[PDB]
Symmetry: C2
Subunit: 89 residues, 2 copies
């Protein structure tokens, strides 16, 4: 397994009310910028991922534009949501 | 009360279900949702979640987007709310 433990923990169970910082790739710096834009729970970011029809390009560009995520951070966040959805949606 | 359509939706993961599997979303509403990019139930769930599950704002968005009346938007909200309580 090449995913982070943090990815594995997120994808192992429903997310409920977990904060945005529970997503892989979302450290404290990105999580603060997300919360300040209203994306305060992980499920709100899931919401954006789903409204963008799970499209990697659009979602990763949106994360960059919204909180300054770099390529690795946006890849990790996308992959964590994609695998969560495959498991639970 | 709830419809069997509601109960069937809230009983399981929605996967790739079409937007018309949502309670309240009949043929006319579904067409208009699909025309605007909301072709699958999970895209509408997405909008519900971006709006932080807010009943008033989601039901207003649905009316603005596809013309849902009050019963249709009530039905659609309630099915997404109960689905999230079971699966999210």
């Amino acid at each position: 397994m090449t995913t982070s433990q943090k990815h594995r923990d997120f994808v192992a169970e429903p997310m409920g009310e977990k904060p945005v910082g529970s997503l892989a790739g979302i450290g404290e710096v990105l999580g603060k910028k997300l919360e300040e834009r209203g994306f305060d729970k992980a499920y709100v970011v899931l919401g954006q991922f789903l409204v963008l029809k799970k499209d990697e390009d659009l979602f990763r560009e949106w994360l960059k534009d919204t909180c300054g995520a770099n390529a690795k951070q946006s890849r990790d966040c996308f992959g964590c949501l994609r695998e969560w959805c495959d498991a639970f949606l």
